[PDB]
Amino acid sequence: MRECISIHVGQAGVQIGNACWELYCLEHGIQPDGQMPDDSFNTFFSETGAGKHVPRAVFVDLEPTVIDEVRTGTYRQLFHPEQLITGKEDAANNYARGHYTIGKEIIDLVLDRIRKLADQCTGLQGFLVFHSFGGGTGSGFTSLLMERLSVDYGKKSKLEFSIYPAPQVSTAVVEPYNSILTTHTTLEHSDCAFMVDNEAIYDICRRNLDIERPTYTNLNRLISQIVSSITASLRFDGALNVDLTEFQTNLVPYPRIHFPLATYAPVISAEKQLSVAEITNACFEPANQMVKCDPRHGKYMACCLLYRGDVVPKDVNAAIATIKTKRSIQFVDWCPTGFKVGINYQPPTVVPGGDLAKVQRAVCMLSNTTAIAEAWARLDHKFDLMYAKRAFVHWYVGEGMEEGEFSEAREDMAALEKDYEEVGVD
Amino acid sequence: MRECISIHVGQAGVQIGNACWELYCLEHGIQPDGQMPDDSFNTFFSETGAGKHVPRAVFVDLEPTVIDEVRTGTYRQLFHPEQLITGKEDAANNYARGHYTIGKEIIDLVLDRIRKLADQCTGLQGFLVFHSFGGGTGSGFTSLLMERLSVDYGKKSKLEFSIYPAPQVSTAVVEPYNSILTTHTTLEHSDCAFMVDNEAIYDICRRNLDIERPTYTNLNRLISQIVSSITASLRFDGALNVDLTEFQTNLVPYPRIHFPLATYAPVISAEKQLSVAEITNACFEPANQMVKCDPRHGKYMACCLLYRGDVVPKDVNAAIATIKTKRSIQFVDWCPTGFKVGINYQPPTVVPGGDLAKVQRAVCMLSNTTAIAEAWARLDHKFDLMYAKRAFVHWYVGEGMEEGEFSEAREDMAALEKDYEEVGV
Amino acid sequence: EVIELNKATSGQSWEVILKPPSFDGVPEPSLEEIQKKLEAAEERRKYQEAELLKHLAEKREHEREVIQKAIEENNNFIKMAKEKLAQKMESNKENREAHLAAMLERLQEKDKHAEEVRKNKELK
Amino acid sequence: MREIVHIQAGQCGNQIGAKFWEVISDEHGIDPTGSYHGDSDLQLERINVYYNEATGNKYVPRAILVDLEPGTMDSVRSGPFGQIFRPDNFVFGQSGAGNNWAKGHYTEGAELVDSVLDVVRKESESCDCLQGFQLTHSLGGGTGSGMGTLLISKIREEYPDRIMNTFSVMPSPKVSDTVVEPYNATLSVHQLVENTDETYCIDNEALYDICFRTLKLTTPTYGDLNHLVSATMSGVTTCLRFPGQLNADLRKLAVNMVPFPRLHFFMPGFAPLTSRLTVPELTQQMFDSKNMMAACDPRHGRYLTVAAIFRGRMSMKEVDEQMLNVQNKNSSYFVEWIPNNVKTAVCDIPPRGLKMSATFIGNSTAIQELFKRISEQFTAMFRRKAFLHWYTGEGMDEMEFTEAESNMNDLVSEYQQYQDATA
Amino acid sequence: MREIVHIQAGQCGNQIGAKFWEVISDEHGIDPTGSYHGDSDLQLERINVYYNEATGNKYVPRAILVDLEPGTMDSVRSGPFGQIFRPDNFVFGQSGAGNNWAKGHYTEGAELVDSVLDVVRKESESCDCLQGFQLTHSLGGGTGSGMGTLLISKIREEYPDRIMNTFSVMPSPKVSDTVVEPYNATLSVHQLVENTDETYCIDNEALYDICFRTLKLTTPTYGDLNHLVSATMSGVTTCLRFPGQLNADLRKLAVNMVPFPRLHFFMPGFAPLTSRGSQQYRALTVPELTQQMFDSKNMMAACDPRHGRYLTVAAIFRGRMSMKEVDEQMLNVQNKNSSYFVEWIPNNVKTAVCDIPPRGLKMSATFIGNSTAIQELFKRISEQFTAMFRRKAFLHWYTGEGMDEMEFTEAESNMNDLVSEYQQYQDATAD
Numbered sequence A: 001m002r003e004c005i006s007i008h009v010g011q012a013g014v015q016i017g018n019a020c021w022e023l024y025c026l027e028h029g030i031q032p033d034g035q036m037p038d039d040s041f042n043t044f045f046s047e048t049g050a051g052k053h054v055p056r057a058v059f060v061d062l063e064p065t066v067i068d069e070v071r072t073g074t075y076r077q078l079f080h081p082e083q084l085i086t087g088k089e090d091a092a093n094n095y096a097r098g099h100y101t102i103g104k105e106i107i108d109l110v111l112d113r114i115r116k117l118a119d120q121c122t123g124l125q126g127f128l129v130f131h132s133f134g135g136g137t138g139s140g141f142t143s144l145l146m147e148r149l150s151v152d153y154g155k156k157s158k159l160e161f162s163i164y165p166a167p168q169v170s171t172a173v174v175e176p177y178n179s180i181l182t183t184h185t186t187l188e189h190s191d192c193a194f195m196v197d198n199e200a201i202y203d204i205c206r207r208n209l210d211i212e213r214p215t216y217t218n219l220n221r222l223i224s225q226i227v228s229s230i231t232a233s234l235r236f237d238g239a240l241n242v243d244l245t246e247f248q249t250n251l252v253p254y255p256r257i258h259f260p261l262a263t264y265a266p267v268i269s270a271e272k273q274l275s276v277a278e279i280t281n282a283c284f285e286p287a288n289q290m291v292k293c294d295p296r297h298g299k300y301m302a303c304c305l306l307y308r309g310d311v312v313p314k315d316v317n318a319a320i321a322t323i324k325t326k327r328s329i330q331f332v333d334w335c336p337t338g339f340k341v342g343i344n345y346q347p348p349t350v351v352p353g354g355d356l357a358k359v360q361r362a363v364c365m366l367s368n369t370t371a372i373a374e375a376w377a378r379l380d381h382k383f384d385l386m387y388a389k390r391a392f393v394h395w396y397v398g399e400g401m402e403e404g405e406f407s408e409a410r411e412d413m414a415a416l417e418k419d420y421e422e423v424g425v426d
Numbered sequence B: 001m002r003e004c005i006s007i008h009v010g011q012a013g014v015q016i017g018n019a020c021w022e023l024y025c026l027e028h029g030i031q032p033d034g035q036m037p038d039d040s041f042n043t044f045f046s047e048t049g050a051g052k053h054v055p056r057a058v059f060v061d062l063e064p065t066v067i068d069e070v071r072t073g074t075y076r077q078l079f080h081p082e083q084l085i086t087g088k089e090d091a092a093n094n095y096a097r098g099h100y101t102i103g104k105e106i107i108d109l110v111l112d113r114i115r116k117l118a119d120q121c122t123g124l125q126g127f128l129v130f131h132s133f134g135g136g137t138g139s140g141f142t143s144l145l146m147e148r149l150s151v152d153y154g155k156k157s158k159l160e161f162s163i164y165p166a167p168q169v170s171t172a173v174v175e176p177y178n179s180i181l182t183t184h185t186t187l188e189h190s191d192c193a194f195m196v197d198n199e200a201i202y203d204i205c206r207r208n209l210d211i212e213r214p215t216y217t218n219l220n221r222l223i224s225q226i227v228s229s230i231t232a233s234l235r236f237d238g239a240l241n242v243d244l245t246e247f248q249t250n251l252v253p254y255p256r257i258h259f260p261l262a263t264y265a266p267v268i269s270a271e272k273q274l275s276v277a278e279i280t281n282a283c284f285e286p287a288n289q290m291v292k293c294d295p296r297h298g299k300y301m302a303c304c305l306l307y308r309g310d311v312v313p314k315d316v317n318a319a320i321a322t323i324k325t326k327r328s329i330q331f332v333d334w335c336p337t338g339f340k341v342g343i344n345y346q347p348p349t350v351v352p353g354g355d356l357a358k359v360q361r362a363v364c365m366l367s368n369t370t371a372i373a374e375a376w377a378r379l380d381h382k383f384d385l386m387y388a389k390r391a392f393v394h395w396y397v398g399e400g401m402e403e404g405e406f407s408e409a410r411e412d413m414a415a416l417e418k419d420y421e422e423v424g425v
Numbered sequence C: 001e002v003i004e005l006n007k008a009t010s011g012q013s014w015e016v017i018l019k020p021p022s023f024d025g026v027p028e029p030s031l032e033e034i035q036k037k038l039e040a041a042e043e044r045r046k047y048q049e050a051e052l053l054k055h056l057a058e059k060r061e062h063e064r065e066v067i068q069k070a071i072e073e074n075n076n077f078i079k080m081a082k083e084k085l086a087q088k089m090e091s092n093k094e095n096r097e098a099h100l101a102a103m104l105e106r107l108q109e110k111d112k113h114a115e116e117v118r119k120n121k122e123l124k
Numbered sequence D: 001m002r003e004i005v006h007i008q009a010g011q012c013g014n015q016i017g018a019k020f021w022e023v024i025s026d027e028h029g030i031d032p033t034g035s036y037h038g039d040s041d042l043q044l045e046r047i048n049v050y051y052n053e054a055t056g057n058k059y060v061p062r063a064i065l066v067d068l069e070p071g072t073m074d075s076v077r078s079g080p081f082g083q084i085f086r087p088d089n090f091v092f093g094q095s096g097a098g099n100n101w102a103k104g105h106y107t108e109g110a111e112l113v114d115s116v117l118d119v120v121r122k123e124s125e126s127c128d129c130l131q132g133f134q135l136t137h138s139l140g141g142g143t144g145s146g147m148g149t150l151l152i153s154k155i156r157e158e159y160p161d162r163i164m165n166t167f168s169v170m171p172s173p174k175v176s177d178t179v180v181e182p183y184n185a186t187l188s189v190h191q192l193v194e195n196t197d198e199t200y201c202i203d204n205e206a207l208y209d210i211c212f213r214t215l216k217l218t219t220p221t222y223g224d225l226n227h228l229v230s231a232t233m234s235g236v237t238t239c240l241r242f243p244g245q246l247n248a249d250l251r252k253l254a255v256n257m258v259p260f261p262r263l264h265f266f267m268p269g270f271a272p273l274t275s276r277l278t279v280p281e282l283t284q285q286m287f288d289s290k291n292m293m294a295a296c297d298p299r300h301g302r303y304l305t306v307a308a309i310f311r312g313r314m315s316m317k318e319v320d321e322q323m324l325n326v327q328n329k330n331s332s333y334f335v336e337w338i339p340n341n342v343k344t345a346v347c348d349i350p351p352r353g354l355k356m357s358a359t360f361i362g363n364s365t366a367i368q369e370l371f372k373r374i375s376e377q378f379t380a381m382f383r384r385k386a387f388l389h390w391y392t393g394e395g396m397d398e399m400e401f402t403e404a405e406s407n408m409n410d411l412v413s414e415y416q417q418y419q420d421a422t423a
Numbered sequence E: 001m002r003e004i005v006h007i008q009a010g011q012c013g014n015q016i017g018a019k020f021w022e023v024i025s026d027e028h029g030i031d032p033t034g035s036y037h038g039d040s041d042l043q044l045e046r047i048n049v050y051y052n053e054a055t056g057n058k059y060v061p062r063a064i065l066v067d068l069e070p071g072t073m074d075s076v077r078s079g080p081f082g083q084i085f086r087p088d089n090f091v092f093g094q095s096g097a098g099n100n101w102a103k104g105h106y107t108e109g110a111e112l113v114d115s116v117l118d119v120v121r122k123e124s125e126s127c128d129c130l131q132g133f134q135l136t137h138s139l140g141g142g143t144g145s146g147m148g149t150l151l152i153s154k155i156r157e158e159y160p161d162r163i164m165n166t167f168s169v170m171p172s173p174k175v176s177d178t179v180v181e182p183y184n185a186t187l188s189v190h191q192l193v194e195n196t197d198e199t200y201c202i203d204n205e206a207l208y209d210i211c212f213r214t215l216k217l218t219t220p221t222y223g224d225l226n227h228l229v230s231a232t233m234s235g236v237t238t239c240l241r242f243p244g245q246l247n248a249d250l251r252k253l254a255v256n257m258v259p260f261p262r263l264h265f266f267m268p269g270f271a272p273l274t275s276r277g278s279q280q281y282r283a284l285t286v287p288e289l290t291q292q293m294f295d296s297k298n299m300m301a302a303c304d305p306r307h308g309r310y311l312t313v314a315a316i317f318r319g320r321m322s323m324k325e326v327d328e329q330m331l332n333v334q335n336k337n338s339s340y341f342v343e344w345i346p347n348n349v350k351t352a353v354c355d356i357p358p359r360g361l362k363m364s365a366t367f368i369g370n371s372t373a374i375q376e377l378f379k380r381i382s383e384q385f386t387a388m389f390r391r392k393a394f395l396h397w398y399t400g401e402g403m404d405e406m407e408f409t410e411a412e413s414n415m416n417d418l419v420s421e422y423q424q425y426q427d428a429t430a431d
């Protein structure tokens, strides 16, 4: 009942999958072989007759090296081999290769495996798709995947967790091309996309966690907490619960305007208790935003607050009532009430040997703000700098794409930027 | 014999019937089991092969809790199940539901039970019909029943005892509608109708009995005394009003104007002996009428004094002579100015343990005055206030009544008002 | 003026007249009709109930039309996603094979030129 | 007319529904095992209005518990009186309504509604004489709102001659759970105008304000709000449940309270207000806006009709005196073309923990304020078509939205029309 | 993307190619008999990129050795690691091409090239996931330049979807007196512009200048120049050969480094500069290493990077050092020298750090730059070409083998076009 299938695409998607699924096992007491000494963890784990609990998940990558670490690592018995899908060549940072040249050779196998996972669900809620914007696979193969999911599953809910690129940690120059191209093609196929900015997570790990040079493992374990807060409503039986369709209904005022901003608090050094009020106020501070942008520059269209741990509804009410009085937190004309509140009572769990401290309560806020448009403007501007000279476009054209797709993607992004302006007018 | 059959329709008619039949049993010596240790009481009671005496009565109420007051009450062995007609849903305060929806479903059953009683009479006089103006069943079903009795018993007299609404005890906002609807439909089918104004009864209980908030039992006990005075000469070998026909003769010169005013005295608290002259004077005090109205605003057409108990003709004529001297009692031109007097020697009787004290002499005056039209005018006014906005009309139409029946019923009451006026000048 | 009327075992009655009248004299539905009126109201009841039920059945069919319309929107979404995906994939395939073929055609033209260079040498 | 069949739908419907059955089970002397352990037989003379009599001296509520999501009903099973309900009367789907009216009313609700009607139909057939139906739900959510009104519609088609009665909770931004409450409520109000006979307007706006302003509860929770709802629901059903000289039932209430069919939205009121007292002051609460469970000021309009119920030991003469004195001093707030439009009952059994109480059921033209407040929130969202695609995606036309708001603004105008009518 | 097939052609090709194999074999723990005697698994994690695994737990370079002159490969077999190569992968003709491009490309070279393709196909078909090909060769002679470019285009025909990469040694009058070398280089550059994806420009002019001016070598030999070549080749292939945070491969390099297909000639740089077989008394610091990115003295092509702008840069740092400090120095050389980076390719410098330093040095830095200043190298070649071509000097050496004048005019136009488009992008504005 109420199953959610998770799909992890490319290096970023797969490595974040590792952090999340590890965290899920700890949260539910599932050992690395699937055995375990509230039934709603079944939305994310099927069960074999042997009492083995198996993630309802596919890992896909076009080259095998990252997924080979899953196949030989701690949780190598958690997944069935057929869930871990790899080709030979990767997309070489090229959307066109991830979407056509290389991606076409493995897409049917992936859809066959997903179709088998769907056959095991009695009330499939939808799909959660994890990927980066900037990679050749994360961008090109995810676009192909989303389009094929629309054919096979119609309007069945599809939500994304997307890594927005950061120069610091990036290793490709064409990332602004891959970003705009996958955003254009995926836009009409996705119901809701939770964007995560690697730069913001990088900065939070330096400031709050005293880590000089955060590694992907630092970033991914922090990203795991956010992902866990969001899916905790689906995996546990709590006081106030939020399912996939409620996320969409309450965060997405127009089909294209579907990019909520995540914020998580508290992020506390393990080597270093915050109240419901304090952690709620933290979600509206621009430093704790999982995407670099300034919400004071914009208007809120919807706030979804997801509490976990030792949190009573009275304190959330008093916390949100304070928020409603801050004039520097501005909501659009056409939104008489913008708050949706989830409370799950199992505290956040942290991986032993990790940098995050154990806390008795935490909150994750998903807000839909016009201020997200700043992150689109930053991306579009990098795209224009290169595109005005057609720098690197020959690599995409060489794989069969036309230049018309580039301008059609870029003009879709300009329309998107102008939509954010229009929904903010009074 | 001169049998009369009593029909009690709706909660008010049933509960007042209970109070009347208990009082009749006390007056005639009939125990609650039906046994009994002047044979005129056979006009109101039949007799079974077990020697039990049975009220010649039918009770109609579509709410079984009310009829259960009869079949489990103190006097329950008096009645046979074929006399108690009940159903599932009552008329929900809606004349149209009682008249059209319920009445079409039960009228044949009800006439069948009445026919069974009538087949036991050798000289059926007619019917005494007890019912409310304001209830949906008392108003809606009664009026259907009176139409059908006019068909099935064309030459039989029909008298009514009608409970006129008072807001103090009323439970329904639409009682003015039901009152006009049932008066319109019943008017040409009744011979003589004694209206009992719940507010008048309520005030007599507060003032004369020192009851702060009278109950239905308080009201019904006092009403039973008036009914008893009116029927006393049917159930005993009296001299005045000895058959139902004599009521129309002595009180109703004009068939449409058939609504006599009853005045009763004395009403004395059991917690606490008046003369013939005092109780005679009390008959001419509006605080003792059964309907609130001012006879100074009208003219009498007929006037009967019904004495009970220790009353001597010399004392009566003396009392009347004193009244004509000090008061001006205005009869219409075409009627003689005077009274028909009867004495019934049977002493007035009260329920043991109740709030009415037992007296040695009592009197009931029945007068046909044009003043009683004020009671219709009060009712007509409330009707007009609601009907001008068509308030609540859709509940009546929803039961298959036509809106225009409101208008027709209201015109008839205007015509009744104009009749009372033209007679009175 | 007192005029006795009657005497009986349980009472007596007379008439007291205080003045004679000024003026001498007094100034001036069948079973089928009832049943037809009751039946008429019954038909009006039933007609109203039938009109209520017909409005409710009209809303049952709107609900069916709403539910079907959503199913048609889903099927047309599927149908247009599928035709656009196949169109994109075919145009890309053609384009890519065309780039590859042009690249081989140019290298083969170099190959013909090499044979012409080798011919020119023996010719001299 | 004895038996009422009670239905509670969605999260709010089941939370206040549960508290209702708790409160009146206490009053009627029923413990959670269904055993009677009370002191008086007034508690049992009309207990069959709401309870079925089982075999083992047991009383089971005639209640049907509905939701598209199992979570909330598992919580009531675990609540205080959770074991008093018939196990086969829980009817719950799995996927939820998504806070979406169109999902509860069309696609998702349609899949569960015939399972509910089979349980309704089994409860109806074991009734000697079915008085009608009593539904508790919110208008702002997806299940109670959308599926509740679908349920009302289907029950009307199958029992068109029975009274349909709802306790309907109106949303307020002050204690919201979803951003589309204005859509969900306006689509439901349109259904209730057409298909219910009597609706008690329970306004979360007013519940919040009572808790914050008179009860000094600086942060009200649903528990605080539902304590007011349960006190009100016990008060309005008093005359249904306890024997009195008024043989009150659901049809008689409609006949005497509803002068025109569309105008069947009642303002409930309660005194005294309490968190978790003389006769004259009780009668004056009738015009105290602070005591109204709908966020309307009765002195902003006129009462068409009023029912008042007094509970506790007190002088029936002193009650009728002060009721008439309130009516006369306040004559300008009653319509003069419905004579005698206030009816009073007194019942000697007080609610738990109170010695004397008063409860008012008013049909006031000031209820137009509640609907105007929903209309303005609807219009602010709908003029930008905010969140509309989640309803069109369920197959709804935009025209359903405009028709439902036109109908609600018409209701507003009709209430205005009778507020200005003169005799 | 695993295996690379290496090809070395002509004298220069086989000498720098042999040095490359000695150098990386020592970095990976392989001795002249193919046996692994190293002490770290990191040396073996990506060993397959360049080596085949043989029978006796041996490792054999995936290397094809080609020359029209038969003696050069007898010199390779004679060399330190000559025993490591597969004997069947030596492909030898009987007469060199006499510094004649047309001999290598059209006549004698064409008669040997099918034998080379025999060996190429067998190394390629045995690959599980072939990345592509790297060719070492010079542009001034006859075999490496003429036959080498013939090989490239023939291999491209059978493997059109693999990456084609070269280490190409540009001639200089300071090092060779052979007068026709500007002809051979210009004819070869024409081929490389059309048929390779990545070319490292190794300039004998710059190698001589480093040896003479910085190493104070009065008369540098090829051994002195090839020491700088082998250090650079080891440096640029570091990320192909060792496990790093980036899984670098030939295609991902091209995609990120080459914004326009023809502009694929990289300027390599190295620090520190050292003489061959010389003890290094003190290492270098991180900001020291970083500064040599703009140091014309450290460039393997005789161009001043400050005379143009970088389109893209890849820098690899080798040794034990802070990656935070590396990142701070690389940010600051960019901040202060912002005028030498095109503004319209955001984030065009990418850095890697490998903890294994090359033999002999504790720390080292290698730069791979796509700079518009590389046009000074092609201008220099083009001026030397013209000075001869205007006189038709030596043209009968080439027409005697069947060529025409027009093929010379065409290659000169193509190279002067290459120069214009480096200039176009050097002057292009973001505004």
Ligand SMILES: Nc1nc2c(ncn2[C@@H]2O[C@H](COP(=O)(O)OP(=O)(O)OP(=O)(O)O)[C@@H](O)[C@H]2O)c(=O)[nH]1
Binding pocket: A009, A010, A011, A012, A013, A015, A016, A062, A063, A090, A091, A092, A093, A094, A098, A132, A133, A134, A135, A136, A137, A138, A139, A163, A164, A165, A166, A169, A170, A171, A175, A198, A216, A219, A220, A223
């Ligand atoms: N947060 C996080 N970001 C990552 C991770 N791995 C890569 N990224 C980011 O993802 C983008 C690079 O895309 P990748 O996901 O590595 O590439 P890919 O999908 O595997 O595609 P190809 O390798 O080009 O076929 C850059 O912005 C990286 O910073 C990770 O493990 N965690």
Ligand SMILES: Nc1nc2c(ncn2[C@@H]2O[C@H](COP(=O)(O)OP(=O)(O)OP(=O)(O)O)[C@@H](O)[C@H]2O)c(=O)[nH]1
Binding pocket: B009, B010, B011, B012, B013, B015, B016, B061, B090, B091, B092, B093, B094, B098, B131, B132, B133, B134, B135, B136, B137, B138, B139, B163, B164, B165, B166, B169, B170, B171, B175, B198, B216, B217, B219, B220, B223
């Ligand atoms: N005097 C007196 N009046 C009564 C009594 N019961 C009801 N009434 C009055 O009668 C009117 C109500 O009519 P009922 O006859 O009781 O009602 P019903 O028609 O049986 O009931 P429905 O079918 O539900 O409408 C109101 O004016 C009541 O005050 C009673 O016992 N005594």
Ligand SMILES: Nc1nc2c(ncn2[C@@H]2O[C@H](COP(=O)(O)OP(=O)(O)OP(=O)(O)O)[C@@H](O)[C@H]2O)c(=O)[nH]1
Binding pocket: E009, E010, E011, E012, E013, E015, E016, E068, E069, E095, E096, E097, E098, E099, E100, E138, E139, E140, E141, E142, E143, E144, E145, E169, E170, E171, E172, E175, E176, E181, E204, E207, E222, E225, E226, E229
């Ligand atoms: N850096 C360097 N340059 C070399 C070396 N050997 C030759 N050269 C240069 O390469 C060019 C001559 O090309 P070669 O490689 O000797 O010619 P080839 O490819 O063997 O062709 P043939 O004419 O058949 O001998 C001139 O520019 C020489 O300076 C070497 O070992 N190192």
Ligand SMILES: COc1ccc2c(c1)NC(=O)CN2c1nc(N2CCOCC2)nc2c1CCC2
Binding pocket: B171, B172, B173, D236, D237, D238, D239, D240, D246, D247, D248, D249, D250, D252, D253, D256, D257, D305, D306, D307, D308, D309, D340, D341, D342, D343, D344, D345
């Ligand atoms: C405006 O005039 C009227 C108003 C209301 C009523 C009546 C007349 N008369 C009646 O019989 C019915 N009725 C009342 N019903 C009810 N309930 C029955 C329906 O369920 C809820 C409880 N409670 C009360 C009353 C009056 C006092 C309290």
Ligand SMILES: COc1ccc2c(c1)NC(=O)CN2c1nc(N2CCOCC2)nc2c1CCC2
Binding pocket: A171, A172, A173, E236, E237, E238, E239, E240, E246, E247, E248, E249, E250, E251, E252, E253, E256, E257, E312, E313, E314, E315, E316, E347, E348, E349, E350, E351, E352
């Ligand atoms: C300007 O942007 C970029 C520049 C270069 C690269 C990338 C982006 N990203 C990448 O994955 C590849 N890559 C690099 N490749 C390589 N080699 C692979 C091909 O053989 C030679 C070694 N060496 C290095 C890098 C960066 C550090 C040294």
Ligand SMILES: Nc1nc2c(ncn2[C@@H]2O[C@H](COP(=O)(O)OP(=O)(O)O)[C@@H](O)[C@H]2O)c(=O)[nH]1
Binding pocket: D009, D010, D011, D012, D013, D015, D016, D097, D098, D099, D100, D138, D139, D140, D141, D142, D143, D144, D145, D169, D170, D171, D172, D175, D176, D177, D178, D181, D204, D207, D222, D225, D226, D229
């Ligand atoms: N008074 C009250 N209101 C509630 C309660 N629960 C939810 N609500 C209100 O109900 C509306 C949301 O509807 P809900 O019942 O949770 O959604 P549903 O389960 O889809 O029917 C909002 O207006 C909430 O404020 C409750 O327990 N008491």
Ligand SMILES: [Mg+2]
Binding pocket: A010, A011, A063, A090, A135, A137
């Ligand atoms: Mg990858």
